[PDB]
Amino acid sequence: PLVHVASVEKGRSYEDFQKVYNAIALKLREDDEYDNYIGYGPVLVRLAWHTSGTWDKHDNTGGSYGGTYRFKKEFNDPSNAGLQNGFKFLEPIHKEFPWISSGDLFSLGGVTAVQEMQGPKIPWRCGRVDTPEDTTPDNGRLPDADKDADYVRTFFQRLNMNDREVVALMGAHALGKTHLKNSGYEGPWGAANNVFTNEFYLNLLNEDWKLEKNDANNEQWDSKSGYMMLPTDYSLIQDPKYLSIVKEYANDQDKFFKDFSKAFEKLLENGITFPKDAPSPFIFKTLEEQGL
Ligand code: HEC
């Protein structure tokens, strides 16, 4: 197993990363029209997860550390279709702050998006270091959506996530939507899809779902409110262990926030060794908290 030791960008401290956070946050506010006024929040959360979610605990390949999505093999992974929009949004940020590593920027984009969308605070640590093109993981390590709960459970063991962490992370599917041209699935999961809430679990339990085929000839679950669930989303209410946890998060907003925060930080930190004297995780203030 490879070791990736966090190395703080030289001379940087919390203030420097709060400025990067702020630039991302201000651009999220400015470029509000994207994706029919959903805004870039959801795609940036997805970019942070896909750049992290290639990790393999068994050999420490993939993961957020190396920033490898900047290389064409990963950029062009069919599982990443659509994420180029988030990369494009981050380009002017990286140009302004060229000292931040790519993995630090992709992960911080996700943290900033969750918090600016009124999600929980996500502690975040710096020090990912860009690694060379030959460290890019091959395609095929991100999950399929047409699968059942057994597939989801097994898939996430590779990311060292347990049932609770899986169910909490999937609550990010409140955000954004599926786009047929990107993934073969179409529609949002709920109404509040650029504000981070526990709506995903409420809709799983509360909506009347019908198994339909979309225009790409794939099955998805649809509600008459115009929401959808992927087969892997719906698996969370088919499996009795996941269903218990879905009910818990549908009934406790604060517990979902706390558990999501922990699991998302862990996702973004998998694979990284933080030296004992590394800085503590940073908790960035939102623009609203700063009066900006
Ligand atoms: C914590 C983050 C998170 C996790 C974990 C996650 N997703 Fe997503 N996913 C998102 C976000 C956010 C979006 C919305 C992106 C957008 O609106 O551009 C999304 C969108 C998608 C889409 C639609 C992409 C498109 O633009 O068409 C698919 C398909 C998808 N997820 C599949 C899955 C599957 C399969 C899993 C696991 C079994 C999963 N996701 C786990 C955050 C996540």
Side-chain angles (χ1 to χ4, degrees), residues 34-35 38 41-43 45-46 49-50 81-83 143-146 151-152 155-156 166 169-170 172-173 175-185 189 230 232-233 260 264 267:
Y34 172 73
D35 207 353
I38 293 171
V43 74
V45 175
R46 199 187 194 216
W49 140 238
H50 276 203
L83 294 181
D144 298 332
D146 55 354
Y151 170 88
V152 170
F155 173 85
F156 273 104
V166 169
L169 285 171
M170 215 75 73
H173 278 176
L175 299 172
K177 64 186 295 288
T178 65
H179 309 84
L180 199 78
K181 285 198 238 148
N182 287 344
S183 64
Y185 294 97
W189 292 269
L230 301 159
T232 46
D233 295 321
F260 181 88
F264 193 65
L267 176 77

mmCIF file of all heavy atoms in Angstrom, residues 34-35 38 41-43 45-46 49-50 81-83 143-146 151-152 155-156 166 169-170 172-173 175-185 189 230 232-233 260 264 267, ligand 1:
data_model
loop_
_atom_site.group_PDB
_atom_site.id
_atom_site.type_symbol
_atom_site.label_atom_id
_atom_site.label_comp_id
_atom_site.label_asym_id
_atom_site.label_seq_id
_atom_site.Cartn_x
_atom_site.Cartn_y
_atom_site.Cartn_z
ATOM 1 N N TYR A 34 -26.446 28.502 -13.671
ATOM 2 C CA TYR A 34 -26.016 27.203 -14.151
ATOM 3 C C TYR A 34 -27.078 26.143 -13.886
ATOM 4 O O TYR A 34 -27.667 26.105 -12.800
ATOM 5 C CB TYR A 34 -24.698 26.866 -13.407
ATOM 6 C CG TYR A 34 -24.256 25.443 -13.698
ATOM 7 C CD1 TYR A 34 -23.725 25.059 -14.924
ATOM 8 C CD2 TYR A 34 -24.419 24.472 -12.715
ATOM 9 C CE1 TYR A 34 -23.335 23.741 -15.164
ATOM 10 C CE2 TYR A 34 -24.043 23.153 -12.919
ATOM 11 C CZ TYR A 34 -23.515 22.802 -14.141
ATOM 12 O OH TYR A 34 -23.128 21.492 -14.426
ATOM 13 N N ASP A 35 -27.268 25.307 -14.893
ATOM 14 C CA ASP A 35 -28.140 24.126 -14.747
ATOM 15 C C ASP A 35 -29.518 24.618 -14.335
ATOM 16 O O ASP A 35 -30.098 24.180 -13.336
ATOM 17 C CB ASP A 35 -27.618 23.102 -13.731
ATOM 18 C CG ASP A 35 -28.096 21.709 -14.065
ATOM 19 O OD1 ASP A 35 -28.914 21.534 -14.967
ATOM 20 O OD2 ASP A 35 -27.635 20.781 -13.330
ATOM 21 N N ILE A 38 -30.088 25.895 -10.727
ATOM 22 C CA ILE A 38 -29.643 25.097 -9.585
ATOM 23 C C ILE A 38 -28.358 25.680 -9.016
ATOM 24 O O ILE A 38 -28.140 25.708 -7.824
ATOM 25 C CB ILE A 38 -29.458 23.641 -10.014
ATOM 26 C CG1 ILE A 38 -30.825 23.017 -10.375
ATOM 27 C CG2 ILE A 38 -28.797 22.829 -8.887
ATOM 28 C CD1 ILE A 38 -30.667 21.614 -11.026
ATOM 29 N N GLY A 41 -23.445 24.362 -6.910
ATOM 30 C CA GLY A 41 -23.220 23.673 -5.624
ATOM 31 C C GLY A 41 -23.221 22.170 -5.801
ATOM 32 O O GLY A 41 -22.246 21.470 -5.402
ATOM 33 N N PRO A 42 -24.265 21.599 -6.342
ATOM 34 C CA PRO A 42 -24.352 20.132 -6.441
ATOM 35 C C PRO A 42 -23.217 19.549 -7.269
ATOM 36 O O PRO A 42 -22.623 18.540 -6.847
ATOM 37 C CB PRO A 42 -25.736 19.918 -7.090
ATOM 38 C CG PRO A 42 -26.524 21.096 -6.552
ATOM 39 C CD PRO A 42 -25.543 22.250 -6.678
ATOM 40 N N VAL A 43 -22.916 20.084 -8.447
ATOM 41 C CA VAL A 43 -21.847 19.468 -9.251
ATOM 42 C C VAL A 43 -20.524 19.571 -8.517
ATOM 43 O O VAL A 43 -19.679 18.679 -8.672
ATOM 44 C CB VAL A 43 -21.832 20.047 -10.676
ATOM 45 C CG1 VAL A 43 -21.266 21.456 -10.760
ATOM 46 C CG2 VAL A 43 -21.084 19.066 -11.589
ATOM 47 N N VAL A 45 -20.129 19.338 -5.220
ATOM 48 C CA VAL A 45 -20.144 18.242 -4.257
ATOM 49 C C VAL A 45 -19.844 16.941 -4.960
ATOM 50 O O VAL A 45 -19.046 16.110 -4.507
ATOM 51 C CB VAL A 45 -21.482 18.193 -3.533
ATOM 52 C CG1 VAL A 45 -21.540 16.957 -2.615
ATOM 53 C CG2 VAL A 45 -21.735 19.473 -2.738
ATOM 54 N N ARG A 46 -20.453 16.728 -6.120
ATOM 55 C CA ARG A 46 -20.218 15.480 -6.852
ATOM 56 C C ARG A 46 -18.782 15.394 -7.283
ATOM 57 O O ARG A 46 -18.177 14.319 -7.254
ATOM 58 C CB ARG A 46 -21.161 15.364 -8.069
ATOM 59 C CG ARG A 46 -21.191 13.886 -8.468
ATOM 60 C CD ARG A 46 -21.955 13.654 -9.771
ATOM 61 N NE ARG A 46 -22.164 12.177 -9.773
ATOM 62 C CZ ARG A 46 -22.138 11.420 -10.877
ATOM 63 N NH1 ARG A 46 -21.771 11.904 -12.088
ATOM 64 N NH2 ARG A 46 -22.474 10.143 -10.830
ATOM 65 N N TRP A 49 -16.711 14.246 -4.423
ATOM 66 C CA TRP A 49 -16.917 12.817 -4.140
ATOM 67 C C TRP A 49 -16.279 11.967 -5.210
ATOM 68 O O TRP A 49 -15.636 10.969 -4.832
ATOM 69 C CB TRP A 49 -18.413 12.600 -4.007
ATOM 70 C CG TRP A 49 -19.075 11.398 -4.579
ATOM 71 C CD1 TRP A 49 -20.083 11.521 -5.492
ATOM 72 C CD2 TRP A 49 -18.882 10.029 -4.377
ATOM 73 N NE1 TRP A 49 -20.552 10.270 -5.877
ATOM 74 C CE2 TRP A 49 -19.838 9.331 -5.196
ATOM 75 C CE3 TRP A 49 -18.039 9.235 -3.576
ATOM 76 C CZ2 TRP A 49 -19.952 7.940 -5.243
ATOM 77 C CZ3 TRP A 49 -18.136 7.861 -3.604
ATOM 78 C CH2 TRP A 49 -19.079 7.241 -4.428
ATOM 79 N N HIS A 50 -16.408 12.270 -6.484
ATOM 80 C CA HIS A 50 -15.817 11.401 -7.511
ATOM 81 C C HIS A 50 -14.294 11.459 -7.534
ATOM 82 O O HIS A 50 -13.651 10.481 -7.896
ATOM 83 C CB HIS A 50 -16.334 11.734 -8.914
ATOM 84 C CG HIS A 50 -17.641 11.035 -9.149
ATOM 85 N ND1 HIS A 50 -18.103 10.768 -10.440
ATOM 86 C CD2 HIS A 50 -18.514 10.501 -8.269
ATOM 87 C CE1 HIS A 50 -19.241 10.085 -10.311
ATOM 88 N NE2 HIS A 50 -19.527 9.918 -9.037
ATOM 89 N N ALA A 81 -19.006 11.923 -16.366
ATOM 90 C CA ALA A 81 -19.620 12.833 -17.337
ATOM 91 C C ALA A 81 -20.416 13.896 -16.626
ATOM 92 O O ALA A 81 -21.273 13.566 -15.785
ATOM 93 C CB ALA A 81 -20.520 12.027 -18.308
ATOM 94 N N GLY A 82 -20.159 15.155 -16.976
ATOM 95 C CA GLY A 82 -20.851 16.288 -16.356
ATOM 96 C C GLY A 82 -19.885 17.021 -15.413
ATOM 97 O O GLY A 82 -20.085 18.235 -15.166
ATOM 98 N N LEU A 83 -18.938 16.296 -14.847
ATOM 99 C CA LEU A 83 -18.065 16.977 -13.846
ATOM 100 C C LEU A 83 -17.168 18.005 -14.452
ATOM 101 O O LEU A 83 -16.644 18.868 -13.715
ATOM 102 C CB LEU A 83 -17.253 15.946 -13.077
ATOM 103 C CG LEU A 83 -18.104 15.016 -12.173
ATOM 104 C CD1 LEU A 83 -17.149 14.072 -11.452
ATOM 105 C CD2 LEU A 83 -18.918 15.830 -11.194
ATOM 106 N N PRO A 143 -19.330 3.985 -8.647
ATOM 107 C CA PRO A 143 -20.382 2.980 -8.616
ATOM 108 C C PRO A 143 -21.390 3.086 -9.749
ATOM 109 O O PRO A 143 -21.677 4.159 -10.279
ATOM 110 C CB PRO A 143 -21.035 3.229 -7.266
ATOM 111 C CG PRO A 143 -20.866 4.712 -7.070
ATOM 112 C CD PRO A 143 -19.455 5.021 -7.604
ATOM 113 N N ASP A 144 -21.956 1.908 -10.064
ATOM 114 C CA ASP A 144 -23.091 1.866 -10.978
ATOM 115 C C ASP A 144 -24.367 2.177 -10.244
ATOM 116 O O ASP A 144 -24.480 1.924 -9.039
ATOM 117 C CB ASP A 144 -23.231 0.433 -11.551
ATOM 118 C CG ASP A 144 -22.077 -0.067 -12.366
ATOM 119 O OD1 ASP A 144 -21.367 0.741 -12.989
ATOM 120 O OD2 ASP A 144 -21.929 -1.320 -12.447
ATOM 121 N N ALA A 145 -25.366 2.694 -10.963
ATOM 122 C CA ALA A 145 -26.594 3.143 -10.333
ATOM 123 C C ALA A 145 -27.723 2.129 -10.507
ATOM 124 O O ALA A 145 -28.800 2.345 -9.931
ATOM 125 C CB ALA A 145 -27.045 4.438 -10.993
ATOM 126 N N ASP A 146 -27.542 1.079 -11.299
ATOM 127 C CA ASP A 146 -28.690 0.244 -11.655
ATOM 128 C C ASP A 146 -28.819 -0.933 -10.690
ATOM 129 O O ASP A 146 -29.709 -1.742 -10.894
ATOM 130 C CB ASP A 146 -28.567 -0.255 -13.097
ATOM 131 C CG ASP A 146 -27.284 -0.981 -13.419
ATOM 132 O OD1 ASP A 146 -26.368 -1.038 -12.561
ATOM 133 O OD2 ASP A 146 -27.206 -1.522 -14.563
ATOM 134 N N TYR A 151 -25.027 -4.736 -3.764
ATOM 135 C CA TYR A 151 -23.983 -4.089 -4.527
ATOM 136 C C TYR A 151 -23.496 -2.848 -3.841
ATOM 137 O O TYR A 151 -22.272 -2.608 -3.751
ATOM 138 C CB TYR A 151 -24.557 -3.761 -5.934
ATOM 139 C CG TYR A 151 -23.584 -2.859 -6.677
ATOM 140 C CD1 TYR A 151 -22.569 -3.408 -7.430
ATOM 141 C CD2 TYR A 151 -23.687 -1.466 -6.598
ATOM 142 C CE1 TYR A 151 -21.661 -2.598 -8.123
ATOM 143 C CE2 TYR A 151 -22.797 -0.667 -7.287
ATOM 144 C CZ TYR A 151 -21.784 -1.228 -8.029
ATOM 145 O OH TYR A 151 -20.914 -0.394 -8.703
ATOM 146 N N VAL A 152 -24.434 -2.001 -3.357
ATOM 147 C CA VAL A 152 -24.017 -0.761 -2.709
ATOM 148 C C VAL A 152 -23.166 -1.055 -1.490
ATOM 149 O O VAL A 152 -22.126 -0.430 -1.245
ATOM 150 C CB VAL A 152 -25.279 0.033 -2.367
ATOM 151 C CG1 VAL A 152 -24.930 1.238 -1.471
ATOM 152 C CG2 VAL A 152 -26.032 0.480 -3.612
ATOM 153 N N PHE A 155 -19.809 -2.326 -2.536
ATOM 154 C CA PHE A 155 -19.028 -1.297 -3.215
ATOM 155 C C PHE A 155 -18.357 -0.416 -2.176
ATOM 156 O O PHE A 155 -17.148 -0.130 -2.274
ATOM 157 C CB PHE A 155 -19.984 -0.434 -4.092
ATOM 158 C CG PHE A 155 -19.211 0.723 -4.665
ATOM 159 C CD1 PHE A 155 -18.484 0.600 -5.814
ATOM 160 C CD2 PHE A 155 -19.191 1.925 -3.959
ATOM 161 C CE1 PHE A 155 -17.688 1.625 -6.326
ATOM 162 C CE2 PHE A 155 -18.419 2.981 -4.441
ATOM 163 C CZ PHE A 155 -17.648 2.798 -5.603
ATOM 164 N N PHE A 156 -19.126 0.033 -1.206
ATOM 165 C CA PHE A 156 -18.589 1.013 -0.261
ATOM 166 C C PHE A 156 -17.653 0.397 0.740
ATOM 167 O O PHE A 156 -16.928 1.174 1.395
ATOM 168 C CB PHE A 156 -19.772 1.713 0.443
ATOM 169 C CG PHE A 156 -20.262 2.905 -0.345
ATOM 170 C CD1 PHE A 156 -21.415 2.852 -1.081
ATOM 171 C CD2 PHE A 156 -19.526 4.080 -0.309
ATOM 172 C CE1 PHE A 156 -21.829 3.971 -1.808
ATOM 173 C CE2 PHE A 156 -19.956 5.200 -1.049
ATOM 174 C CZ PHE A 156 -21.128 5.167 -1.789
ATOM 175 N N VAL A 166 -22.623 4.963 4.528
ATOM 176 C CA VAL A 166 -23.221 4.900 3.212
ATOM 177 C C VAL A 166 -24.530 5.650 3.175
ATOM 178 O O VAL A 166 -24.779 6.436 2.253
ATOM 179 C CB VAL A 166 -23.423 3.428 2.792
ATOM 180 C CG1 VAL A 166 -24.284 3.323 1.544
ATOM 181 C CG2 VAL A 166 -22.047 2.795 2.529
ATOM 182 N N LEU A 169 -23.905 9.387 3.456
ATOM 183 C CA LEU A 169 -23.349 10.005 2.234
ATOM 184 C C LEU A 169 -24.394 10.090 1.143
ATOM 185 O O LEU A 169 -24.379 11.052 0.380
ATOM 186 C CB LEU A 169 -22.167 9.136 1.730
ATOM 187 C CG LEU A 169 -20.896 9.311 2.595
ATOM 188 C CD1 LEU A 169 -19.879 8.252 2.151
ATOM 189 C CD2 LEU A 169 -20.346 10.747 2.458
ATOM 190 N N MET A 170 -25.262 9.090 1.053
ATOM 191 C CA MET A 170 -26.245 9.144 -0.069
ATOM 192 C C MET A 170 -27.202 10.302 0.082
ATOM 193 O O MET A 170 -27.857 10.671 -0.932
ATOM 194 C CB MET A 170 -27.036 7.835 -0.103
ATOM 195 C CG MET A 170 -27.349 7.449 -1.543
ATOM 196 S SD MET A 170 -25.930 6.796 -2.447
ATOM 197 C CE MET A 170 -25.801 5.172 -1.681
ATOM 198 N N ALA A 172 -26.547 13.237 0.083
ATOM 199 C CA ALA A 172 -26.158 14.275 -0.859
ATOM 200 C C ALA A 172 -26.998 14.200 -2.128
ATOM 201 O O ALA A 172 -27.006 15.200 -2.841
ATOM 202 C CB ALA A 172 -24.662 14.165 -1.173
ATOM 203 N N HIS A 173 -27.696 13.125 -2.365
ATOM 204 C CA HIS A 173 -28.629 13.067 -3.503
ATOM 205 C C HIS A 173 -29.864 13.918 -3.250
ATOM 206 O O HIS A 173 -30.701 13.979 -4.150
ATOM 207 C CB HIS A 173 -28.973 11.631 -3.841
ATOM 208 C CG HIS A 173 -27.907 11.019 -4.687
ATOM 209 N ND1 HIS A 173 -27.961 9.681 -5.052
ATOM 210 C CD2 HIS A 173 -26.779 11.514 -5.260
ATOM 211 C CE1 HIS A 173 -26.901 9.392 -5.819
ATOM 212 N NE2 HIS A 173 -26.153 10.500 -5.970
ATOM 213 N N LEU A 175 -29.308 16.875 -3.550
ATOM 214 C CA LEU A 175 -28.749 17.996 -4.309
ATOM 215 C C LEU A 175 -28.790 17.728 -5.803
ATOM 216 O O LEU A 175 -28.566 16.599 -6.231
ATOM 217 C CB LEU A 175 -27.291 18.194 -3.931
ATOM 218 C CG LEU A 175 -27.035 18.514 -2.463
ATOM 219 C CD1 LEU A 175 -25.506 18.474 -2.261
ATOM 220 C CD2 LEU A 175 -27.638 19.857 -2.066
ATOM 221 N N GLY A 176 -29.060 18.788 -6.590
ATOM 222 C CA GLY A 176 -28.819 18.681 -8.033
ATOM 223 C C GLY A 176 -29.865 17.794 -8.696
ATOM 224 O O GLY A 176 -31.040 17.717 -8.305
ATOM 225 N N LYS A 177 -29.412 17.091 -9.719
ATOM 226 C CA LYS A 177 -30.312 16.209 -10.452
ATOM 227 C C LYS A 177 -29.456 15.246 -11.259
ATOM 228 O O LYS A 177 -28.271 15.410 -11.426
ATOM 229 C CB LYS A 177 -31.265 17.008 -11.347
ATOM 230 C CG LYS A 177 -30.549 17.770 -12.442
ATOM 231 C CD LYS A 177 -31.414 18.687 -13.262
ATOM 232 C CE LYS A 177 -32.491 17.963 -14.093
ATOM 233 N NZ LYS A 177 -31.882 17.239 -15.215
ATOM 234 N N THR A 178 -30.159 14.222 -11.776
ATOM 235 C CA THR A 178 -29.597 13.397 -12.853
ATOM 236 C C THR A 178 -29.928 14.060 -14.175
ATOM 237 O O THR A 178 -30.992 14.700 -14.313
ATOM 238 C CB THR A 178 -30.123 11.953 -12.756
ATOM 239 O OG1 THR A 178 -31.560 11.941 -12.980
ATOM 240 C CG2 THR A 178 -29.891 11.346 -11.380
ATOM 241 N N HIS A 179 -28.970 13.920 -15.114
ATOM 242 C CA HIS A 179 -29.132 14.510 -16.431
ATOM 243 C C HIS A 179 -28.998 13.376 -17.426
ATOM 244 O O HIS A 179 -27.970 12.697 -17.444
ATOM 245 C CB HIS A 179 -28.065 15.556 -16.671
ATOM 246 C CG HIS A 179 -27.906 16.581 -15.610
ATOM 247 N ND1 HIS A 179 -27.140 16.374 -14.496
ATOM 248 C CD2 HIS A 179 -28.359 17.858 -15.528
ATOM 249 C CE1 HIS A 179 -27.126 17.468 -13.760
ATOM 250 N NE2 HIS A 179 -27.866 18.387 -14.354
ATOM 251 N N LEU A 180 -30.020 13.193 -18.270
ATOM 252 C CA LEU A 180 -29.998 11.982 -19.129
ATOM 253 C C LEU A 180 -28.728 11.861 -19.955
ATOM 254 O O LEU A 180 -28.152 10.768 -20.105
ATOM 255 C CB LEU A 180 -31.254 12.056 -20.030
ATOM 256 C CG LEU A 180 -31.605 10.676 -20.613
ATOM 257 C CD1 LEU A 180 -32.301 9.816 -19.561
ATOM 258 C CD2 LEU A 180 -32.475 10.860 -21.837
ATOM 259 N N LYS A 181 -28.248 12.994 -20.486
ATOM 260 C CA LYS A 181 -27.061 12.898 -21.367
ATOM 261 C C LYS A 181 -25.781 12.564 -20.640
ATOM 262 O O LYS A 181 -24.818 12.120 -21.243
ATOM 263 C CB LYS A 181 -26.910 14.216 -22.139
ATOM 264 C CG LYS A 181 -27.956 14.324 -23.262
ATOM 265 C CD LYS A 181 -27.459 15.389 -24.219
ATOM 266 C CE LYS A 181 -28.471 16.516 -24.379
ATOM 267 N NZ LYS A 181 -27.842 17.850 -24.634
ATOM 268 N N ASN A 182 -25.759 12.827 -19.316
ATOM 269 C CA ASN A 182 -24.588 12.518 -18.528
ATOM 270 C C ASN A 182 -24.569 11.055 -18.109
ATOM 271 O O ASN A 182 -23.532 10.403 -18.265
ATOM 272 C CB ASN A 182 -24.497 13.314 -17.219
ATOM 273 C CG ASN A 182 -24.137 14.788 -17.457
ATOM 274 O OD1 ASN A 182 -23.672 15.159 -18.542
ATOM 275 N ND2 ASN A 182 -24.385 15.623 -16.466
ATOM 276 N N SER A 183 -25.693 10.567 -17.548
ATOM 277 C CA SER A 183 -25.655 9.288 -16.828
ATOM 278 C C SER A 183 -26.725 8.306 -17.261
ATOM 279 O O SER A 183 -26.756 7.165 -16.764
ATOM 280 C CB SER A 183 -25.834 9.575 -15.322
ATOM 281 O OG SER A 183 -27.147 10.129 -15.138
ATOM 282 N N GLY A 184 -27.621 8.738 -18.187
ATOM 283 C CA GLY A 184 -28.692 7.767 -18.551
ATOM 284 C C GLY A 184 -29.844 7.850 -17.570
ATOM 285 O O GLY A 184 -30.683 6.902 -17.643
ATOM 286 N N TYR A 185 -29.908 8.819 -16.654
ATOM 287 C CA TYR A 185 -31.002 8.962 -15.737
ATOM 288 C C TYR A 185 -31.441 10.415 -15.791
ATOM 289 O O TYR A 185 -30.592 11.262 -16.073
ATOM 290 C CB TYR A 185 -30.554 8.658 -14.279
ATOM 291 C CG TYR A 185 -30.193 7.195 -14.184
ATOM 292 C CD1 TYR A 185 -28.890 6.763 -14.280
ATOM 293 C CD2 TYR A 185 -31.234 6.267 -14.042
ATOM 294 C CE1 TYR A 185 -28.599 5.416 -14.200
ATOM 295 C CE2 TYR A 185 -30.931 4.901 -13.968
ATOM 296 C CZ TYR A 185 -29.608 4.484 -14.044
ATOM 297 O OH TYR A 185 -29.317 3.137 -13.973
ATOM 298 N N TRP A 189 -34.101 14.661 -7.316
ATOM 299 C CA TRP A 189 -34.545 13.823 -6.251
ATOM 300 C C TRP A 189 -35.540 14.527 -5.347
ATOM 301 O O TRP A 189 -36.175 13.862 -4.542
ATOM 302 C CB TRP A 189 -33.358 13.368 -5.404
ATOM 303 C CG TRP A 189 -32.385 12.456 -6.020
ATOM 304 C CD1 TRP A 189 -32.474 11.064 -5.952
ATOM 305 C CD2 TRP A 189 -31.207 12.768 -6.748
ATOM 306 N NE1 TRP A 189 -31.409 10.535 -6.605
ATOM 307 C CE2 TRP A 189 -30.606 11.540 -7.106
ATOM 308 C CE3 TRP A 189 -30.566 13.980 -7.147
ATOM 309 C CZ2 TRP A 189 -29.428 11.432 -7.821
ATOM 310 C CZ3 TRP A 189 -29.365 13.869 -7.868
ATOM 311 C CH2 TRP A 189 -28.819 12.626 -8.194
ATOM 312 N N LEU A 230 -32.644 6.745 -8.143
ATOM 313 C CA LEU A 230 -31.940 5.698 -8.843
ATOM 314 C C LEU A 230 -32.249 4.334 -8.225
ATOM 315 O O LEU A 230 -32.570 4.294 -7.028
ATOM 316 C CB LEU A 230 -30.430 5.900 -8.739
ATOM 317 C CG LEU A 230 -29.914 7.241 -9.314
ATOM 318 C CD1 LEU A 230 -28.557 7.591 -8.741
ATOM 319 C CD2 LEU A 230 -29.876 7.182 -10.847
ATOM 320 N N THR A 232 -30.069 2.368 -7.058
ATOM 321 C CA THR A 232 -29.248 2.293 -5.831
ATOM 322 C C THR A 232 -29.771 3.163 -4.698
ATOM 323 O O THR A 232 -29.560 2.833 -3.545
ATOM 324 C CB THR A 232 -27.799 2.677 -6.154
ATOM 325 O OG1 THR A 232 -27.781 3.856 -6.963
ATOM 326 C CG2 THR A 232 -27.105 1.574 -6.954
ATOM 327 N N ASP A 233 -30.427 4.270 -5.036
ATOM 328 C CA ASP A 233 -31.084 5.067 -3.991
ATOM 329 C C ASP A 233 -32.214 4.295 -3.349
ATOM 330 O O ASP A 233 -32.369 4.192 -2.141
ATOM 331 C CB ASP A 233 -31.701 6.349 -4.568
ATOM 332 C CG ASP A 233 -30.689 7.348 -5.122
ATOM 333 O OD1 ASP A 233 -29.614 7.517 -4.525
ATOM 334 O OD2 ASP A 233 -31.019 7.920 -6.184
ATOM 335 N N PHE A 260 -23.348 13.085 8.226
ATOM 336 C CA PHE A 260 -22.858 13.405 6.916
ATOM 337 C C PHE A 260 -21.523 14.098 6.978
ATOM 338 O O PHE A 260 -20.590 13.817 6.239
ATOM 339 C CB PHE A 260 -23.843 14.308 6.181
ATOM 340 C CG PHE A 260 -23.337 14.617 4.802
ATOM 341 C CD1 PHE A 260 -23.622 13.775 3.730
ATOM 342 C CD2 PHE A 260 -22.611 15.779 4.567
ATOM 343 C CE1 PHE A 260 -23.160 14.040 2.473
ATOM 344 C CE2 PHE A 260 -22.084 16.030 3.298
ATOM 345 C CZ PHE A 260 -22.376 15.186 2.237
ATOM 346 N N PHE A 264 -18.377 12.618 5.142
ATOM 347 C CA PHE A 264 -17.836 13.337 3.954
ATOM 348 C C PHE A 264 -16.409 13.747 4.208
ATOM 349 O O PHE A 264 -15.564 13.636 3.308
ATOM 350 C CB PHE A 264 -18.750 14.508 3.666
ATOM 351 C CG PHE A 264 -18.531 15.154 2.334
ATOM 352 C CD1 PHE A 264 -18.777 14.444 1.166
ATOM 353 C CD2 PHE A 264 -18.105 16.465 2.194
ATOM 354 C CE1 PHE A 264 -18.646 15.032 -0.084
ATOM 355 C CE2 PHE A 264 -17.974 17.068 0.945
ATOM 356 C CZ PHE A 264 -18.244 16.354 -0.195
ATOM 357 N N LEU A 267 -14.467 10.578 3.685
ATOM 358 C CA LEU A 267 -14.345 10.283 2.269
ATOM 359 C C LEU A 267 -13.227 11.118 1.650
ATOM 360 O O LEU A 267 -12.409 10.621 0.840
ATOM 361 C CB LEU A 267 -15.682 10.584 1.612
ATOM 362 C CG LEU A 267 -15.777 10.429 0.116
ATOM 363 C CD1 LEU A 267 -15.873 8.922 -0.270
ATOM 364 C CD2 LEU A 267 -16.968 11.219 -0.426
HETATM 365 C C1 HEC B 1 -21.638 12.493 -1.063
HETATM 366 C C2 HEC B 1 -21.744 12.580 -2.344
HETATM 367 C C3 HEC B 1 -22.491 11.563 -3.148
HETATM 368 C C4 HEC B 1 -22.433 10.220 -3.081
HETATM 369 C C5 HEC B 1 -21.805 9.338 -2.038
HETATM 370 C C6 HEC B 1 -23.070 9.689 -4.250
HETATM 371 N N1 HEC B 1 -23.480 10.713 -5.070
HETATM 372 FE FE1 HEC B 1 -24.305 10.569 -6.867
HETATM 373 N N2 HEC B 1 -24.455 12.544 -6.977
HETATM 374 C C7 HEC B 1 -24.113 13.470 -5.986
HETATM 375 C C8 HEC B 1 -24.524 14.777 -6.384
HETATM 376 C C9 HEC B 1 -24.373 15.982 -5.465
HETATM 377 C C10 HEC B 1 -25.155 14.688 -7.562
HETATM 378 C C11 HEC B 1 -25.814 15.789 -8.417
HETATM 379 C C12 HEC B 1 -24.858 16.357 -9.460
HETATM 380 C C13 HEC B 1 -25.434 17.447 -10.336
HETATM 381 O O1 HEC B 1 -26.601 17.870 -10.064
HETATM 382 O O2 HEC B 1 -24.717 17.875 -11.270
HETATM 383 C C14 HEC B 1 -25.080 13.309 -7.948
HETATM 384 C C15 HEC B 1 -25.518 12.781 -9.136
HETATM 385 C C16 HEC B 1 -25.483 11.467 -9.517
HETATM 386 C C17 HEC B 1 -25.934 10.949 -10.774
HETATM 387 C C18 HEC B 1 -26.379 11.798 -11.943
HETATM 388 C C19 HEC B 1 -25.183 12.446 -12.678
HETATM 389 C C20 HEC B 1 -25.742 13.272 -13.813
HETATM 390 O O3 HEC B 1 -25.362 14.467 -13.916
HETATM 391 O O4 HEC B 1 -26.532 12.724 -14.608
HETATM 392 C C21 HEC B 1 -25.782 9.596 -10.719
HETATM 393 C C22 HEC B 1 -26.136 8.570 -11.806
HETATM 394 C C23 HEC B 1 -25.318 9.273 -9.431
HETATM 395 N N3 HEC B 1 -25.142 10.408 -8.661
HETATM 396 C C24 HEC B 1 -25.051 8.004 -8.974
HETATM 397 C C25 HEC B 1 -24.625 7.673 -7.709
HETATM 398 C C26 HEC B 1 -24.412 6.341 -7.204
HETATM 399 C C27 HEC B 1 -24.598 5.111 -8.102
HETATM 400 C C28 HEC B 1 -23.891 6.437 -5.990
HETATM 401 C C29 HEC B 1 -23.618 5.372 -4.965
HETATM 402 C C30 HEC B 1 -24.206 4.168 -5.003
HETATM 403 C C31 HEC B 1 -23.814 7.830 -5.666
HETATM 404 N N4 HEC B 1 -24.231 8.599 -6.754
HETATM 405 C C32 HEC B 1 -23.279 8.351 -4.510
HETATM 406 C C33 HEC B 1 -23.430 13.143 -4.828
HETATM 407 C C34 HEC B 1 -23.131 11.871 -4.402
#
